[PDB]
Ligand SMILES: CC(=O)N[C@@H]1[C@@H](O)[C@H](O[C@@H]2O[C@H](CO[C@]3(C(=O)O)C[C@H](O)[C@@H](NC(C)=O)[C@H]([C@H](O)[C@H](O)CO)O3)[C@H](O)[C@H](O)[C@H]2O)[C@@H](CO)O[C@H]1O
């Protein structure tokens with residue numbers, strides 16, 4: 161009579177199924193989830209500077225729609241646009257809206273520097289009841305609606321050189337009246353024109369007379385354009401009517417700033433990764449919450465679960481029942 | 482798995498072994514008992530911790546990107562923006578699927594391997610004083626009191642001590 165010595169390994173009562181090269185489901189002792197599939201529903205206010213747009217799109221804050229005046233000179237890592245946002249100034253369009261929104265979002269600032277443009281022989285600071293500011297008529301804070309002085313609108317020809325060491329972003333526009341009566345009444349000339357140029361580029365916009373749909377008291381429109389002026393270059397603005405003039409320029413930065421559409425409330429917490437659904441943890445390498453992300457995020461994948469085996473094959477003793 | 486120990490020549494695991502991943506069960510003159518092997522247990526765990534930390538290594542931080550949802554139909558440019566994102570997501574989804582498949586196959590093979598490594602090491606300790614029954618158990622051909630069993634488990638078992646005793650019992 162001697163002895164027996166058996167070698168073996170553990171097992172557990174409750175194993176997990178995982179995928180392998182040879183098996184689509186096979187049981188191991190433990191595994192861990194590699195796909196983040198949940199969010200708190202809330203955007204953490206740290207560590208990124210979150211700016212809630214509230215009632216305002218970035219573009220309306222840029223232009224200076226009065227109910228968006230609170231955004232003057234603001235900065236952000238992430239600007240959050242809400243589905244409840246509305247415009248409440250003169251009706252307008254932006255050809256290439258998406259690009260202007262992108263470049264401003266990326267710049268991360270609305271810092272505005274006023275410049276003393278000289279508009280000889282026109283009336284400045286035009287307003288409208290479409291864009292109330294306090295009790296009276298008003299306008300976009302960063303734009304200067306020019307109309308005739310007396311019975312003339314001369315050829316406007318002005319310059320603003322950039323002798324700084326940073327880029328200037330100028331926002332300007334063109335007024336499209338609904339009737340010929342309106343055109344001549346405001347600008348004298350029967351057809352206006354706006355030419356904005358630098359050494360290397362130029363934009364010429366001819367206004368267009370005609371009704372558009374009635375929006376906030378007006379069938380007319382303003383179209384918004386932009387021009388970047390680099391150090392050593394010069395802005396020239398030439399117009400015989402319909403110019404919506406800049407009051408200055410926006411400072412441009414480069415950096416980590418962006419914009420996101422989300423209705424998630426902002427809360428006091430810390431999360432590197434932000435989605436429109438809210439912040440998510442980033443301990444896992446993959447996520448199924450949203451393909452739209454900002455920050456240090458798991459990579460978006462289609463699977464809602466992927467299990468990484470963290471133990472051996474789980475082999476229970478063959479059972480009698 | 483590739484080594485054929487776990488779910489192979491070892492019929493099943495031990496739910497009873499709660500202090501380790503691999504180990505020993507014995508029967509001798511003094512009764513029966515169980516003990517975990519720490520080295521093999523730790524080798525498996527260290528290798529699994531290693532791959533876990535490699536996999537969960539944070540490696541991408543992205544800020545301004547392209548838009549991925551659209552409120553207006555636009556055509557060509559939007560088709561491309563969508564296709565770019567859909568292409569990316571599919572490639573990442575594939576990487577993720579392949580990664581877990583490879584990782585998990587390997588995890589099963591390495592755990593199977595570690596079982597086998599402990600078994601071969603034990604077989605080598607016992608030299609000619611035992612025989613492989615073929616089910617993970619050695620029949621030892623001599624008196625092996627708890628001191629002797631623990632000597633095998635903690636690596637101090639001298640086979641020359643019991644060789645004459647054992648060789649006789651084997652061939653007689
Ligand atoms: C400039 C002028 O002389 N305007 C007189 C109009 O006030 C007047 O009647 C109404 O105009 C209504 C819309 O009005 C404003 C506006 O709030 O938008 C008044 C502004 O002061 C004016 N701003 C400037 C800088 O000129 C502005 C502008 O002309 C238009 O927005 C251009 O699109 O118009 C509304 O349409 C009413 O239906 C209208 O009766 C008209 C007609 O009597 O006479 C104008 O002399």
Ligand SMILES: *[C@@H]1O[C@H](CO)[C@@H](O[C@@H]2O[C@H](CO)[C@@H](O[C@@H]3O[C@H](CO)[C@@H](O)[C@H](O)[C@@H]3O)[C@H](O)[C@H]2NC(C)=O)[C@H](O)[C@H]1NC(C)=O
Pocket residue numbers: 317318319394396
């Ligand atoms: C409209 O406004 C612009 C902007 O000020 C005027 O441009 C300027 O035009 C003059 C010539 O008429 C240019 O002068 C030249 O400058 C060089 C120095 O580099 C000098 O050596 C030459 O002999 C010449 O005099 C000036 O550079 C130019 N300025 C800019 C910034 O482009 C334009 O003439 C105005 N037009 C009208 C009709 O008012």
Ligand SMILES: *[C@@H]1O[C@H](CO)[C@@H](O[C@@H]2O[C@H](CO)[C@@H](O)[C@H](O)[C@H]2NC(C)=O)[C@H](O)[C@H]1NC(C)=O
Pocket residue numbers: 197198199436437448449450550
């Ligand atoms: C995060 O939010 C998105 C939407 O912003 C959710 O996806 C939508 O929900 C269902 C599919 O589950 C669809 O009917 C919608 O069409 C989806 N929209 C999009 C744009 O994909 C998503 O399920 C949310 N996830 C979590 C975890 O909250």
Ligand SMILES: *[C@@H]1O[C@H](CO)[C@@H](O)[C@H](O)[C@H]1NC(C)=O
Pocket residue numbers: 190191192193470
């Ligand atoms: C198994 O892994 C989970 C994570 O999926 C972890 O929380 C737990 O501590 C592990 N359990 C055991 C018994 O090791």
Ligand SMILES: *[C@@H]1O[C@H](CO)[C@@H](O)[C@H](O)[C@H]1NC(C)=O
Pocket residue numbers: 232233271272273274
């Ligand atoms: C915006 O900032 C500039 C300096 O960067 C300053 O000249 C201007 O007065 C500021 N305006 C507001 C409303 O803070």
